Write a protein that holds these residues in place. Sequence first.
Motif, PDB file in Angstrom:
ATOM      1  N   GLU A   1       0.921  -1.111  -0.109  1.00 30.62           N
ATOM      2  CA  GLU A   1       0.041  -0.056   0.012  1.00 30.62           C
ATOM      3  C   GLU A   1       0.779   1.365  -0.008  1.00 30.62           C
ATOM      4  OE1 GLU A   1      -3.812  -2.307   1.783  1.00 30.62           O
ATOM      5  OE2 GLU A   1      -2.648  -1.361   3.191  1.00 30.62           O
ATOM      6  N   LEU A   2       1.974   1.291   0.500  1.00 28.68           N
ATOM      7  CA  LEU A   2       2.811   2.128   0.774  1.00 28.68           C
ATOM      8  C   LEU A   2       3.344   2.559  -0.603  1.00 28.68           C
ATOM      9  CD1 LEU A   2       4.928   4.023   2.448  1.00 28.68           C
ATOM     10  CD2 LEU A   2       6.412   2.057   2.429  1.00 28.68           C
ATOM     11  N   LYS A   3       3.903   1.416  -1.417  1.00 27.58           N
ATOM     12  CA  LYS A   3       4.395   1.311  -2.498  1.00 27.58           C
ATOM     13  C   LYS A   3       3.451   2.135  -3.607  1.00 27.58           C
ATOM     14  CE  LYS A   3       5.782  -2.593  -4.639  1.00 27.58           C
ATOM     15  NZ  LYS A   3       4.119  -2.399  -5.150  1.00 27.58           N
ATOM     16  N   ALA A   4       2.198   1.764  -3.562  1.00 33.27           N
ATOM     17  CA  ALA A   4       1.146   2.344  -4.298  1.00 33.27           C
ATOM     18  C   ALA A   4       1.008   3.840  -3.944  1.00 33.27           C
ATOM     19  CB  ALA A   4      -0.212   1.613  -4.188  1.00 33.27           C
ATOM     20  N   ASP A   5       0.985   4.253  -2.751  1.00 31.91           N
ATOM     21  CA  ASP A   5       0.574   5.632  -2.579  1.00 31.91           C
ATOM     22  C   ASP A   5       1.999   6.484  -2.824  1.00 31.91           C
ATOM     23  OD1 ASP A   5      -0.661   7.856  -1.098  1.00 31.91           O
ATOM     24  OD2 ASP A   5       0.965   7.467   0.537  1.00 31.91           O
ATOM     25  N   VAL A   6       3.219   5.908  -2.431  1.00 30.94           N
ATOM     26  CA  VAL A   6       4.425   6.804  -2.795  1.00 30.94           C
ATOM     27  C   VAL A   6       4.378   6.995  -4.279  1.00 30.94           C
ATOM     28  CG1 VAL A   6       7.202   6.994  -3.064  1.00 30.94           C
ATOM     29  CG2 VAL A   6       6.024   6.198  -0.911  1.00 30.94           C
ATOM     30  N   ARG A   7       4.019   5.874  -5.388  1.00 34.79           N
ATOM     31  CA  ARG A   7       4.025   6.011  -6.765  1.00 34.79           C
ATOM     32  C   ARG A   7       3.047   6.873  -7.111  1.00 34.79           C
ATOM     33  NH1 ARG A   7       3.076   1.179 -11.065  1.00 34.79           N
ATOM     34  NH2 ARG A   7       2.745   2.488 -12.649  1.00 34.79           N
ATOM     35  N   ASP A   8       1.741   7.045  -6.462  1.00 29.93           N
ATOM     36  CA  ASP A   8       0.773   7.834  -6.836  1.00 29.93           C
ATOM     37  C   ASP A   8       1.228   9.317  -6.524  1.00 29.93           C
ATOM     38  OD1 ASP A   8      -2.027   8.555  -7.895  1.00 29.93           O
ATOM     39  OD2 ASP A   8      -2.416   8.835  -5.390  1.00 29.93           O
ATOM     40  N   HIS A   9       2.284   9.544  -5.672  1.00 30.96           N
ATOM     41  CA  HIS A   9       2.742  10.928  -5.596  1.00 30.96           C
ATOM     42  C   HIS A   9       3.982  11.180  -6.057  1.00 30.96           C
ATOM     43  CE1 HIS A   9      -0.410  10.660  -2.332  1.00 30.96           C
ATOM     44  NE2 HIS A   9       0.009  11.734  -1.850  1.00 30.96           N
ATOM     45  N   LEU A  10       4.672  10.523  -7.092  1.00 32.87           N
ATOM     46  CA  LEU A  10       5.972  10.824  -7.533  1.00 32.87           C
ATOM     47  C   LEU A  10       5.944  12.002  -8.321  1.00 32.87           C
ATOM     48  CD1 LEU A  10       7.040   7.276  -9.019  1.00 32.87           C
ATOM     49  CD2 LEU A  10       8.061   8.597  -7.298  1.00 32.87           C
TER      50      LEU A  10
END
Length: 251
Positions: free
Chosen positions: A169-178
């Motif tokens: 979930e962290l991975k997805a959120d960070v990615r969505d914030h790049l």
Amino acid sequence: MMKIVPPKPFFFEAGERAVLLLHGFTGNSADVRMLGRFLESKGYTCHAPIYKGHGVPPEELVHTGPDDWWQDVMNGYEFLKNKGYEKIAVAGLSLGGVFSLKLGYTVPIEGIVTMCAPMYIKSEETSYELVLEYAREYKKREGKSEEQIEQEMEKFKQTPMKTLKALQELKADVRDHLDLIYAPTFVVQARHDEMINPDSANIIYNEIESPVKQIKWYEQSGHVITLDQEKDQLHEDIYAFLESLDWLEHH
């Protein structure tokens, strides 16, 4: 049987420039110590926290997740602030890479180095395998019989590991914030990475909005690039990267 001595953070005082160093999932400050020693020899101050749940029994690790680990990362940032370092760059291995990007769009950051940070799906099965591996190894070191490791490994497998999906979930959120990241960024990727889908690094490189950005591919390294055979080249490249950043207060 035997207690296993947990790992400690480190703080290498040198000069007025500061770097936060962030380790990998199930690892500890050892993942980034040699890089710390190198940067300190070049005059850069270095702090390396340890994530909660790390360097302790695997049963304790799965009671923790990125909300906890993020708190140690933020606490590491604040540690350097409070000792008086105003400009802080950040440099992370894998999971540490993801936290470094996250720090990129959360607090003032002079520069980001992300080393083999995952952004897709191979991460999901290899994070499970990594956790099993840490567990068997920790059990061995504490001197337990093979049959007791087999028993405690079966129980471990059949008990909640919600930290593994919190990670996804962290991975997805960070990615969505790049695309919120503007800070100069160095992407570092091992070509022959058996832990993550290495195209992850193209993802990071492409989708950040940083005007200053670089990517290097390392052709002889595996996932754990800080401890693998090209690490001395990596030391240099990261050093050159930091020397190319601003570090000055502008009028």
